[PDB]
């Protein structure tokens, strides 16, 4: 909801190189906003444009405290990039 | 810090390297402040 989207949040942008890339939300969220400012993981701020007609706001990145939990369903914002990130962490970081 | 890693390696004499690397690998931050173990720390422990 609009309450969820705030400043300094993390959302997953669909991208060609990586299916979903984390991104900061420096600009405060505006309900019904066409474009928002997002800080890229590369460090370069990107003014990513939202689709107000059909597109939905990117999935909120779950807090890192939830990452590493055994249960996939244990993550709050449950969605495909969250699962991908968690399983990647467990395979690589957790071996 | 690896300066703490060497002390840990010195003190953890009884437990073998297998349990040490496993427990470092499976550590979990219960609270927000705590952070996951770095892979570089794992490499330092393994090589030392």
């Amino acid at each position: 909801a609009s309450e969820l989207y705030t400043k300094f949040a993390r959302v997953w942008i669909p991208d060609p190189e990586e299916v979903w890339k984390s991104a900061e939300l420096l600009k405060d969220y505006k309900p019904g906003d066409k474009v928002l400012l997002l800080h890229l993981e590369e460090g370069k701020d990107l003014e990513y444009r939202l689709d107000p007609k059909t597109g939905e706001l990117p999935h909120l990145r779950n807090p890192d405290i939830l990452v590493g939990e055994n249960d996939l369903t244990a993550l709050s914002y449950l969605h495909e990039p969250a699962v991908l990130h968690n399983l990647r962490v467990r395979f690589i970081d957790s071996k | 810090t690896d300066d703490d890693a060497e002390a840990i390696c010195s003190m953890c004499n009884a437990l073998t390297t297998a349990q040490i690397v496993k427990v470092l690998n499976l550590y979990t931050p219960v609270n927000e402040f705590e952070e996951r173990v770095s892979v570089s720390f794992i490499r330092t422990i393994q090589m030392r």
Side-chain angles (χ1 to χ4, degrees):
Chain A
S2 61
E3 179 73 18
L4 282 71
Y5 284 84
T6 51
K7 294 183 70 64
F8 310 114
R10 293 184 298 174
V11 292
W12 296 95
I13 296 170
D15 287 323
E17 327 293 332
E18 176 67 31
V19 191
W20 311 93
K21 288 195 191 174
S22 164
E24 268 292 323
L25 187 49
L26 305 184
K27 184 193 298 168
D28 70 297
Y29 165 73
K30 315 289 196 181
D33 207 4
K34 186 177 183 291
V35 65
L36 283 178
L37 157 70
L38 280 78
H39 162 259
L40 290 191
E41 290 162 290
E42 319 162 354
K44 184 260 292 179
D45 291 331
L46 173 64
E47 189 67 32
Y48 164 67
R49 195 258 306 167
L50 307 156
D51 295 354
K53 274 76 69 178
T54 318
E56 189 63 29
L57 322 169
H59 306 115
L60 295 89
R61 183 176 185 186
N62 272 311
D64 297 353
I65 67 164
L66 299 179
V67 183
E69 286 160 345
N70 284 318
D71 197 328
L72 298 178
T73 74
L75 302 171
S76 198
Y77 305 132
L78 183 63
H79 58 86
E80 160 199 353
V83 176
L84 190 55
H85 191 257
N86 202 20
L87 66 91
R88 169 194 307 174
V89 166
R90 301 177 56 85
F91 170 54
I92 311 176
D93 310 346
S94 194
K95 301 294 185 289
Chain B
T1 63
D2 64 332
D3 179 42
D4 296 330
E6 59 93 18
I8 296 164
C9 298
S10 63
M11 61 79 71
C12 190
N13 44 70
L15 305 168
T16 76
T17 51
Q19 315 101 28
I20 301 162
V21 64
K22 193 59 165 57
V23 66
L24 277 296
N25 193 20
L26 59 86
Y27 179 67
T28 299
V30 63
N31 300 355
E32 185 274 342
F33 66 94
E34 195 83 21
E35 57 164 5
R36 209 181 319 272
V37 185
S38 163
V39 64
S40 63
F41 207 73
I42 301 299
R43 302 280 73 71
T44 54
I45 301 299
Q46 197 274 336
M47 61 79 71
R48 183 164 201 90

